[PDB]
Amino acid sequence: LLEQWNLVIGFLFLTWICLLQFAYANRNRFLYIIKLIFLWLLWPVTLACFVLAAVYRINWITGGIAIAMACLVGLMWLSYFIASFRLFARTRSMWSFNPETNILLNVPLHGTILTRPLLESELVIGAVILRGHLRIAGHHLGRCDIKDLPKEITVATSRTLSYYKLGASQRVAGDSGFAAYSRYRIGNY
Amino acid sequence: LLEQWNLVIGFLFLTWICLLQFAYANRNRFLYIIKLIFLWLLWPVTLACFVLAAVYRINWITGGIAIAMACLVGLMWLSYFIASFRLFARTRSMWSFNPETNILLNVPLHGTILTRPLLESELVIGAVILRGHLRIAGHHLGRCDIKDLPKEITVATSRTLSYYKLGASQRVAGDSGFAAYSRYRIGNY
Amino acid sequence: EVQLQQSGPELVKPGASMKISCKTSGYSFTGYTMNWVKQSHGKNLEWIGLINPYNGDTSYNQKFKGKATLTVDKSSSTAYMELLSLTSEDSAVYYCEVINTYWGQGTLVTVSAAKTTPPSVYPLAPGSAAQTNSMVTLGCLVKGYFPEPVTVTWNSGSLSSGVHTFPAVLQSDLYTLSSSVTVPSSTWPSETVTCNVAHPASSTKVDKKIVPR
Amino acid sequence: EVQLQQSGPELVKPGASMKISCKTSGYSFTGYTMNWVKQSHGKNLEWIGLINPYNGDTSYNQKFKGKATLTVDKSSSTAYMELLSLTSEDSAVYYCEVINTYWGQGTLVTVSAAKTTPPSVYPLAPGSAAQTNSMVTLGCLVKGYFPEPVTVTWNSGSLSSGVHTFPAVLQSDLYTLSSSVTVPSSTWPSETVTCNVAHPASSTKVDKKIVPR
Amino acid sequence: DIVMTQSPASLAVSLGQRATISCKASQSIDYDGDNYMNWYQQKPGQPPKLLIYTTSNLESGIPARFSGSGSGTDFTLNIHPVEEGDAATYYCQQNNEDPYTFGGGTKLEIKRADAAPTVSIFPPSSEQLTSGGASVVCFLNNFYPKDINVKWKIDGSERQNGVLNSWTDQDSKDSTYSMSSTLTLTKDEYERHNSYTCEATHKTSTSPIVKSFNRNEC
Amino acid sequence: DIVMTQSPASLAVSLGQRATISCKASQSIDYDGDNYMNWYQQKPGQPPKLLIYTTSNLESGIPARFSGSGSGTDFTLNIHPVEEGDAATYYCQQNNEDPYTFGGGTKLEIKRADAAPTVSIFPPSSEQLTSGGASVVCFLNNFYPKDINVKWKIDGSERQNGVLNSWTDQDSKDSTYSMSSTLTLTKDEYERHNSYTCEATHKTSTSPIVKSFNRNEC
Ligand SMILES: [K+]
Ligand SMILES: [K+]
């Protein structure tokens, strides 16, 4: 039945709406993974809609487009798998399979490197400390002071590693502060 | 019947995937409108899925959940309308109806104030200039230099107007640069 | 950089209205909010209100609601404050700031029904001093003028060291001020010394050459 | 702040491997990548490679592949470079940096089959000078030692002004060095002057008191 | 709304010392875990210059010797080391709720080695004399501290009424004050007396410094 | 592999002037429209100190007188004003492609007023004399410029072979050099001659400064 498939899609839409209204600004790592888990399954459920329209077609024009669009999503899904596994070879990090970007941000906080997805990987990376909590490029990494800021962070993408040097860190309003991460060398493979 | 709705959702996900993959990093203002246009219509189509399941009430357990779940997405859609029209009263700008946040960021660039949605509105706002192009909080605003950075930006939300002050601008690698906006006063409405 | 130019001091009759212009330069006028601050009796800084030049919404102090109205002129990049029903409590200095860093020079509003009086300028030299060590003082006294302020300089500002311009004091609804300069005997009277007194409210600019008696 | 302590100089026979320890402090060791730089002949800076101490992946120079192997020890926060098959071209100073800002003091590697020789330390004073102006020079000469380097100080580093430690020069496969200090006649010989020569390769630390003849 | 009790009313510190300026808000101005306190500096004849915003952030171009502390209701401005140019009035403004009320302000006095006042006496000018009145002037230059009393003596008796004093602000070059005393008198009584005397009793010494002249001496 | 060429090989400027140091990359290092050029400073006996990274960005704590310019292949390091402590060796490193090759490096020399060399003569020590050999030493201190020739004189004839010279780097306190000349000789020939002389011909004057001694004089 399509009625039960209608309810599944309604919960898929409802899940994101909750993630878009109540958990958008929130950057909890478990919550962020759940958002990435949802965005990953957005590719099979895009393919499932077109496969259902391809098999249970209305007209050959409608079914023919759904066959082409299922290949279009299928090609875009394999392009994610190709780019992520190529990224996974360089980094050996489980964040390489995030479905939003193929670039990783490595911040050495609390000793262990805190790898996070990075969207743009620009020349300058912004580090903001708020109430003693560091957030770099919209990733709430955790507790970190101005004096405890990582003196060097790296950004890893496919066939290129970008090392970033801490620039000028300015402390504002006590616990809060700001920092500058200008790229200084490129570790291209 | 009920198969054409499958094709509509398939293109809704296909548009979602393209915006989330191909044009995720791209910050063209017309494209950013399209992303906000798509996220706005995600509320009627979440309600449309649950109304369709509520109308097709073959079993009371599935239909009864869909009736209650359509109320949950129905109420939080009107919660968006209530929150945005309150924001529209204070700001009188068409960006108040963005479906991602109820907080607006006003950056005075090129004379006319550039108003953009702001997800966080924290104490410190980072302004990254890359290749002579300013991007504040992930919103690419346009051509700007370190010497041409706005000395004061404001962040307008409901019942609060937070004025931000240019802390210190650092120039890196020539055209690029970096500066921070620390809040210095609040215009409590 | 960011320069805010205001109108000069003026004398306003009691129970009237005055518009204070804050001409801006060096930045986009509609860019940042324009605050207004009143400093009464020389120390009491009071916040009047702010106006956003882009759209025009204002936010006044509750004390100054109905007293001051903030307006802008985007074409001339000039922000105005129009005070209403001026009383003797409004004899203050009004400033305009942008981000609390760049301020106007302040407009000295004098709310009085007094008649603007031209200043009386008198040079003062140690006639028959009988003591001519190489540090001799000579002065220029401005008596009976209204309203504030006046500018007293020496030789068109050529001499800047050893100058002392004492604050004005009120008497019989007239302000009095003095200026003094100490120069060595190698200067007096070999080089010309002249005190220049300018009062813009009376639109007067007098120059007095000091001479021994 | 961030301090990188390296091992001292070691005289290595040709063809023998050597591991250079770079002990780190003041920061989380696994946090930042550890570069290695070779400075041959005192001027030619050459990049050897970098090792990420968190996971262990390396990136060598093409010339130094098979010559140097970079390893780390997270337990002791010490990064190692194990040079392989040392030849005379490897007589250089090897540095370990972090973000190119914080550097180690350098490990002077001397690849020679020469026999370690203890230094010969001799004080030199102006005996029978017949000229005692209040600027008199006295020296300490180190002759016939191997390998580099040696540290020559005066009175355990109490005197820092007027010191001159001349660079060593090679002769008959033996380096020679000199140190000189000029002090006023009000010092010599009232206060004790002693030259301290330390050679860690020979594990010797000699102290010589200078005396007039 | 919110009132600021900035203490002390006046502050007097020496060069190179630490100047502590307190400013206690009536209620907590804390918003989102942060206090928004501004600190201004206003030299005489000049608009206020912002030193510190958001209770700690130093303004660009302001020397690093200015530091803001405190949270909740108590707020402190610390100046160390104090230079000669810091002799001004310091205000505290709460940038949290409308109205952004300022503090009472405290003038910072630079405690500098006491000095003797340079005394000078000016008889009324001839041009003013023929105008119908007269005014005898006494100038004190480069004296410290500010507290001082100057008296005028007419023909063997001191006179209080008709004397106006003008004090200058603390100079930004030597941290010393100047005073101008003026005795005005109609021409009717100017020629009825001969001796005109100005005497100053300052803390710099136990000798009251006296400068006098005579009408017929000119 | 990218080759970096620095011109000049050695740079000599006076205090307060502008020192221009070039670095011409063989290949363009424009990555994403940006060049990653690192400028280091290495005083003798010390590891290199990073001055400028990413071709313009100054390292924290470095004085704001080192400026990096140029893009593409030509890169320039400018030091203005030049102080006494800037006498070191400056390297350029391309931080773009493996290997991050360094430049040839240039030894910056401070141009200071010319001074006369302080000359001192040391006869061989008695302890070394009884060991089987001898070495007579001549020290020049606080002289400028670096170019100078010192000669040894034995019993009326100058000798060239057997003379070793050691030059010190430019000092970071007076910008003057020091030289140590050593004449070594076996004990067989040491007692066969009496007079030992060290003479220096420097540009500071037209008089060759001479210091000599005798074996039997001791
Ligand atoms: K990926
Ligand atoms: K909204």
Short mmCIF file of N, CA, C and O in Angstrom, two decimals, chain C residues 8-39:
data_model
loop_
_atom_site.label_atom_id
_atom_site.label_comp_id
_atom_site.label_asym_id
_atom_site.label_seq_id
_atom_site.Cartn_x
_atom_site.Cartn_y
_atom_site.Cartn_z
N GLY C 8 27.18 75.06 16.20
CA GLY C 8 27.85 75.73 17.29
C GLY C 8 26.90 76.08 18.41
O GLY C 8 25.70 75.80 18.37
N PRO C 9 27.46 76.69 19.46
CA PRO C 9 26.62 77.13 20.59
C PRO C 9 25.64 78.21 20.16
O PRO C 9 25.92 79.03 19.28
N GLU C 10 24.48 78.21 20.81
CA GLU C 10 23.43 79.18 20.50
C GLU C 10 22.66 79.52 21.76
O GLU C 10 22.66 78.77 22.74
N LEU C 11 21.99 80.67 21.73
CA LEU C 11 21.15 81.13 22.82
C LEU C 11 19.69 80.98 22.40
O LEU C 11 19.26 81.58 21.41
N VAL C 12 18.94 80.17 23.14
CA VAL C 12 17.55 79.88 22.84
C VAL C 12 16.69 80.51 23.93
O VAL C 12 16.97 80.35 25.12
N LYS C 13 15.65 81.23 23.51
CA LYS C 13 14.73 81.83 24.47
C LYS C 13 13.95 80.73 25.20
O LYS C 13 13.69 79.67 24.63
N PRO C 14 13.60 80.96 26.46
CA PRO C 14 12.86 79.94 27.22
C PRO C 14 11.50 79.66 26.61
O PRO C 14 10.86 80.53 26.02
N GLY C 15 11.05 78.42 26.77
CA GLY C 15 9.78 77.99 26.21
C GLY C 15 9.75 77.96 24.70
O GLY C 15 8.72 78.30 24.10
N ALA C 16 10.85 77.57 24.07
CA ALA C 16 10.91 77.51 22.61
C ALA C 16 11.43 76.15 22.16
O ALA C 16 11.57 75.23 22.97
N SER C 17 11.70 76.01 20.86
CA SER C 17 12.20 74.77 20.29
C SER C 17 13.52 75.03 19.58
O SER C 17 13.75 76.11 19.04
N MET C 18 14.39 74.02 19.59
CA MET C 18 15.68 74.12 18.93
C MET C 18 16.00 72.80 18.25
O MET C 18 15.79 71.73 18.83
N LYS C 19 16.50 72.88 17.02
CA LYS C 19 16.91 71.71 16.26
C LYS C 19 18.43 71.65 16.23
O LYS C 19 19.09 72.61 15.82
N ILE C 20 18.99 70.52 16.66
CA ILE C 20 20.43 70.32 16.74
C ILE C 20 20.83 69.37 15.62
O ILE C 20 20.38 68.22 15.57
N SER C 21 21.68 69.86 14.72
CA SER C 21 22.14 69.08 13.58
C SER C 21 23.46 68.40 13.90
O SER C 21 24.35 69.01 14.49
N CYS C 22 23.57 67.13 13.51
CA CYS C 22 24.77 66.33 13.73
C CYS C 22 25.22 65.81 12.37
O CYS C 22 24.87 64.70 11.97
N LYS C 23 26.00 66.62 11.66
CA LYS C 23 26.45 66.25 10.32
C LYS C 23 27.53 65.18 10.40
O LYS C 23 28.51 65.33 11.14
N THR C 24 27.36 64.11 9.64
CA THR C 24 28.24 62.96 9.69
C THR C 24 29.10 62.89 8.43
O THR C 24 28.72 63.40 7.37
N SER C 25 30.26 62.26 8.56
CA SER C 25 31.18 62.09 7.45
C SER C 25 32.05 60.87 7.70
O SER C 25 32.16 60.38 8.83
N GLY C 26 32.65 60.36 6.62
CA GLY C 26 33.56 59.25 6.71
C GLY C 26 32.92 57.88 6.76
O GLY C 26 33.65 56.88 6.84
N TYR C 27 31.60 57.80 6.72
CA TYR C 27 30.91 56.51 6.78
C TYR C 27 29.53 56.67 6.17
O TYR C 27 29.04 57.79 5.97
N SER C 28 28.90 55.54 5.86
CA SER C 28 27.54 55.53 5.33
C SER C 28 26.57 55.93 6.44
O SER C 28 26.46 55.23 7.45
N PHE C 29 25.87 57.05 6.24
CA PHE C 29 25.04 57.64 7.28
C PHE C 29 23.97 56.68 7.78
O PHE C 29 23.75 56.53 8.98
N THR C 30 23.29 56.00 6.85
CA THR C 30 22.28 55.02 7.23
C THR C 30 22.89 53.76 7.83
O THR C 30 22.14 52.85 8.20
N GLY C 31 24.22 53.68 7.92
CA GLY C 31 24.85 52.45 8.38
C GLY C 31 24.56 52.13 9.83
O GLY C 31 23.98 51.09 10.15
N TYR C 32 24.95 53.02 10.74
CA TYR C 32 24.91 52.72 12.16
C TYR C 32 23.99 53.70 12.89
O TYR C 32 23.74 54.81 12.43
N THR C 33 23.49 53.25 14.04
CA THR C 33 22.55 54.02 14.84
C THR C 33 23.21 55.25 15.43
O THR C 33 24.39 55.23 15.81
N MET C 34 22.44 56.34 15.52
CA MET C 34 22.92 57.63 16.00
C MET C 34 22.34 57.87 17.39
O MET C 34 21.14 58.13 17.52
N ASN C 35 23.18 57.80 18.41
CA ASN C 35 22.77 58.06 19.78
C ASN C 35 22.88 59.54 20.10
O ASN C 35 23.62 60.29 19.45
N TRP C 36 22.12 59.97 21.10
CA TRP C 36 22.16 61.35 21.58
C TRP C 36 22.30 61.35 23.10
O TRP C 36 21.55 60.65 23.79
N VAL C 37 23.25 62.12 23.60
CA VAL C 37 23.58 62.16 25.02
C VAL C 37 23.59 63.61 25.48
O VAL C 37 24.19 64.47 24.82
N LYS C 38 22.93 63.89 26.60
CA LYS C 38 22.88 65.21 27.20
C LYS C 38 23.77 65.25 28.43
O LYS C 38 23.63 64.41 29.32
N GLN C 39 24.66 66.23 28.49
CA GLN C 39 25.53 66.45 29.64
C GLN C 39 25.15 67.77 30.29
O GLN C 39 25.48 68.84 29.78
#
